[PDB]
Design an enzyme around this catalytic site. Structure first.
Site, PDB file in Angstrom:
ATOM      1  N   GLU A  42      28.078 119.434 -15.079  1.00 30.28           N
ATOM      2  CA  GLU A  42      29.188 118.593 -15.309  1.00 30.28           C
ATOM      3  C   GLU A  42      28.601 116.939 -14.905  1.00 30.28           C
ATOM      4  O   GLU A  42      28.627 115.909 -15.863  1.00 30.28           O
ATOM      5  CB  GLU A  42      30.011 118.779 -14.396  1.00 30.28           C
ATOM      6  CG  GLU A  42      31.786 118.495 -15.315  1.00 30.28           C
ATOM      7  CD  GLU A  42      32.568 118.968 -14.555  1.00 30.28           C
ATOM      8  OE1 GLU A  42      33.072 118.661 -13.083  1.00 30.28           O
ATOM      9  OE2 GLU A  42      33.544 120.009 -14.934  1.00 30.28           O
TER      10      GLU A  42
ATOM     11  N   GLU B  90      47.094 105.339  23.586  1.00 32.42           N
ATOM     12  CA  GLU B  90      48.566 105.258  23.915  1.00 32.42           C
ATOM     13  C   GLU B  90      48.517 103.367  24.037  1.00 32.42           C
ATOM     14  O   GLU B  90      49.303 102.748  23.182  1.00 32.42           O
ATOM     15  CB  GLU B  90      48.893 105.317  25.198  1.00 32.42           C
ATOM     16  CG  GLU B  90      49.105 106.832  25.272  1.00 32.42           C
ATOM     17  CD  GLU B  90      49.212 107.339  26.908  1.00 32.42           C
ATOM     18  OE1 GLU B  90      48.907 106.690  27.736  1.00 32.42           O
ATOM     19  OE2 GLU B  90      49.606 108.519  27.128  1.00 32.42           O
TER      20      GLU B  90
END
Ligand SMILES: Nc1ncnc2c1ncn2[C@@H]1O[C@H](COP(=O)(O)OP(=O)(O)OP(=O)(O)O)[C@@H](O)[C@H]1O
Ligand SMILES: Nc1ncnc2c1ncn2[C@@H]1O[C@H](COP(=O)(O)OP(=O)(O)OP(=O)(O)O)[C@@H](O)[C@H]1O
Ligand SMILES: Nc1ncnc2c1ncn2[C@@H]1O[C@H](COP(=O)(O)OP(=O)(O)OP(=O)(O)O)[C@@H](O)[C@H]1O
Ligand SMILES: Nc1ncnc2c1ncn2[C@@H]1O[C@H](COP(=O)(O)OP(=O)(O)OP(=O)(O)O)[C@@H](O)[C@H]1O
Ligand SMILES: [Mg+2]
Ligand SMILES: [Mg+2]
Ligand SMILES: [Mg+2]
Ligand SMILES: [Mg+2]
Ligand SMILES: [Mg+2]
Ligand SMILES: [Mg+2]
Ligand SMILES: [Mg+2]
Ligand SMILES: [Mg+2]
EC number: 2.7.11.1
Lengths: 492, 485
Positions: A64, A305
């Site tokens: 391909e 945080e």
């Protein structure tokens, strides 16, 4: 040979383990998966590593992608296959259709194609073969029966050529059938499955080995990561439990805490810190990562945080200058939202940093962050991962959790990770007269004595100040204590 | 004949028990399963075993895997099929397709090939036959209907040859149709289903005898492990309740504790050491694993939490040396992550090491380390797996557990296995004056007396020092007592 099947090292991070040695020598390995799952990257790395490290030539067949693209994208991982081609180490056998057109291309096709490869293998004196997308060959007007026989015609003749081979196949559903015509899974000996499972809106990628005839191999999905160095797998389930352990101590940052642990933490020992939001996990991480710089030991600090700025602001307000810790090149801050990647991703990332900078300490603030979303297991696995590595690496890791509920933490894990960790520090607010004050305990130390006192503490511009227990209280742990004693002082 | 169906033994570990003897003689057994389940292995072992235990020869008709390979893959197990086809005890029937090109040779199809196998059998006087991947034969161009005829044609042709058969089929959907053309299921007297179920990024091979025309068999799925010695199966349902029991006693390693249990643990018993994280379950663990050496008995210590090197660290810090132990070959160590194997597997490893080191005491520090991301049921099945064996084997096992909450936990085990173990030791904290102090307490003993109180105990270099209880207190269990003046 009267000897059991021998494998061929692939050099792809992790695959070798999962595969207990690599690809069975002399046989073809089917490697199917859906689109964008690294099937081609899998075969290229296979052929490649074999040239760079074992000087084993390799032949690449493609039905391909034009060779040109193949070499291009290789550059994604810093690979100049282009060269290995020019030094005869690599040879791309272009087998893709022409943008023009010719009918009936299935008769002479395979057989003629086989001899072509035979010529290629034989000519360049190769040892590795990758046939990219055999699936795109019977996609002309065929069905299950014709397919079956055709693979067997190719897996076998190849087998007669005795070359270690890799074939790629595509898939439609993620956990649906193994390959396309649900027929390859058999006509082949060894079937590896690369997935890109959805779940949530994050995509995680696993790699399995449904079967290697005649040999052994780790059973199940193990996540892997495609990166600037190709495919990286993590044999999480393979990591041996033989990590070393010294009796050496180090400091937590606050000396009074250094007493309550019987003289500090152990270099080899995972350390957790729990408390409901606000207690002070960060303050402990702060002084922890700092302590490690004053001795001239590098220490990374992964936050998930707070920001890089705010992580340097509140830090300053406790004294300690991270800014300096960075300049001297003894500290390092990462910062990254948890929804920025899947656990499989951070683990690698963290593992990554640890390799370049080679810390002396590790301080991941908020396991509770990473726990966001991600099913309890997936996370649990992460944890071991981190801990198990950082451990078998002699690094001191302080971790942070934050109880889903302030006051009343009936579980010091809120996900039951306790048992994975070696030292446990517990922070808890305590309602003492219409005022939420801090407390701090050393729940458990695996090698030391540590103090059994639930000491209170205050936070100021100096940092934490571990004072005196609440001996005159019942229900301390309950967060809302009670005063005792019913006798003052009077006469005889 | 006028009497029941005589079975033939497969000698396949555990299968003779799930089939109640073996394969129905002179009758075929259709064993299907998706790719990578062992169908080949099952049938190759079948013929094989018949050759090394009964001397009953074998014909292995192979449609797709080339004879030479069939021989090579069996070396994985230590099987010399090459030697067996020489000694003429086993014959591999090459029934595969031509690697080159021919289409007008199989026009006598089914019939012709049967004449062959029937020749070979009469030639080696074989007793068992396995046709590997018959589905692959039809995989030329057939409809469900063309199969039922061709098959019934073969099966029968082989029934008439009083041959005990095992055909192999392949599946695509784990819990869906039994075979490909959903027809074989009814064409074979016996049905064996091999399943490689996933569920949770983990695989688990389960075998099942769907039916057996004629006699009885175990019903349902059983777990199995493909290993060097082939298919290994554990019929956790075929293990009866017949374990020798006694009043002999053993020490817990802690003299005090021994008294608290009314003079040591019982030999033939499973003791559980539940408790919060840190209460010291691993402290007692080492203890009970050491007293087994002071008595010159072998004791194995399976770890699933701390390293072996770290163990040997905290060991030394409580006194008692582990190094010595191993040297004297009186204490074996293990170690492995619960995620580093499946339950079905972990089980076997234990049995394994045990058979090899004949322990007298087993320690499984944290069964609560294995329950990890596993099904409550599956896991209960894993406890009974161990428990039982160690019982029947007269072994004394000590199992660690950690409750999902310190102080206040409203159960001994969150997985409810207590009703499996005989003696439960129980560690928990208790907050006494802004302090965390430990407290051991024997909760139950089926044959003995055992104290009933919760004595506080301290840990230090020398070890566990069981003291006295919290008499003048209340709700010591609520983890946060109320001293009542
Ligand atoms: N350097 C890289 N860093 C991170 N991701 C990459 C890199 N190179 C490629 N990728 C990712 O890998 C994928 C490429 O997959 P690959 O070409 O290896 O095989 P495939 O998609 O399975 O099969 P096919 O070759 O038919 O497309 C892309 O989807 C892309 O997201
Ligand atoms: N300079 C300071 N002086 C006095 N108290 C401070 C100071 N800085 C922060 N604090 C206190 O410390 C707490 C902040 O928590 P900290 O930075 O230690 O992280 P955490 O408790 O681990 O996590 P999170 O705040 O995200 O819940 C607040 O509750 C606040 O009252
Ligand atoms: N020595 C060994 N040790 C551990 N595992 C093995 C060993 N040999 C084989 N295996 C495992 O057992 C499986 C073998 O299955 P087997 O090839 O016997 O038959 P099948 O999967 O039923 O059918 P087929 O492979 O012919 O399509 C492999 O998938 C592999 O994981
Ligand atoms: N040498 C020692 N001196 C004083 N106390 C110790 C010593 N060793 C351990 N301890 C105490 O014992 C506890 C350690 O628990 P231990 O090593 O016995 O395993 P565990 O409680 O069964 O399991 P886990 O460590 O997973 O919680 C700590 O909480 C600590 O207070
Ligand atoms: Mg693609
Ligand atoms: Mg491709
Ligand atoms: Mg098969
Ligand atoms: Mg925080
Ligand atoms: Mg087979
Ligand atoms: Mg019927
Ligand atoms: Mg514990
Ligand atoms: Mg422990």
């Amino acid at each position: 040979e009267h000897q059991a099947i021998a494998k061929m090292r692939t050099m792809i991070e992790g695959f070798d383990d999962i595969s207990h040695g690599g690809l069975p020598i002399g046989r073809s390995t089917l490697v199917s998966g859906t689109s964008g799952t690294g099937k081609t990257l899998f075969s290229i790395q296979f052929l490649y590593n074999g040239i760079i490290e074992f000087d084993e030539p390799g032949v690449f067949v493609t039905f391909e992608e034009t060779p040109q693209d193949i070499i291009k994208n290789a550059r994604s991982f810093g690979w100049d296959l282009a060269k290995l081609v020019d030094e005869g180490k690599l040879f791309i056998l272009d087998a893709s259709p022409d943008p023009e057109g010719q009918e009936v291309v299935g008769g002479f096709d395979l057989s003629a194609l086989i001899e072509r490869i035979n010529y290629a293998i034989q000519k360049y004196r190769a040892r590795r073969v990758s046939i990219d997308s055999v699936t795109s060959v019977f996609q002309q007007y065929d069905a299950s029966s014709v397919v079956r026989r055709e693979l067997f015609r190719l897996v076998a003749r190849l087998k007669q050529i005795g070359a270690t081979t890799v074939m790629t196949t595509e898939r439609i559903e993620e956990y649906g059938p193994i390959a396309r015509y649900g027929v390859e899974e058999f006509v082949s000996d060894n079937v590896v499955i690369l997935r890109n499972v959805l779940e949530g809106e994050r995509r995680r990628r696993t790699l399995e080995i449904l079967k290697l005839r005649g040999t052994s191999h780790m059973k199940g999905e193990y996540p892997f990561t495609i990166t600037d160095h190709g495919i990286n797998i993590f044999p999480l389930g393979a990591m041996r439990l033989t990590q070393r352990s010294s009796n050496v101590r180090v400091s937590s940052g606050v000396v009074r805490l250094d007493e309550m642990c019987g003289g500090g933490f152990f270099k080899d020992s995972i350390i957790l810190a729990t408390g409901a939001t606000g207690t002070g996990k960060t303050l402990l991480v702060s002084r922890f990562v700092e302590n490690a710089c004053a001795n001239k030991e590098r220490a990374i600090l992964f936050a998930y945080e707070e920001s890089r700025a705010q992580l340097l602001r509140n830090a300053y307000s406790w004294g300690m200058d991270f800014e300096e810790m960075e300049r001297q090149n003894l500290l390092k801050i990462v910062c990254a939202y948890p929804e920025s990647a899947g656990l499989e991703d951070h683990l690698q990332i963290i593992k990554s940093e640890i390799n370049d900078f080679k810390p002396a300490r590790i301080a991941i603030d908020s396991l509770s962050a990473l726990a966001r979303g991600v099913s309890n297991n997936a996370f649990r696995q992460f944890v071991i991962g981190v801990t198990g590595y950082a451990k078998q690496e002699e690094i001191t890791g302080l971790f942070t959790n934050t109880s889903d509920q302030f006051m009343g933490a009936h579980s010091i894990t809120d996900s039951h990770i306790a048992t994975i960790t070696d030292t446990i520090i517990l922070l808890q607010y305590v309602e003492i007269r219409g005022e939420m004050s801090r407390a701090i305990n050393v729940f458990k130390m695996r090698g030391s004595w540590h103090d059994k006192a639930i000491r209170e503490f205050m936070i100021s511009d100096k940092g934490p100040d571990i004072k005196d227990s609440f001996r005159n209280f019942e229900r301390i742990i309950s967060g809302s204590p009670t005063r005792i004693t019913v006798d003052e002082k009077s006469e005889l």
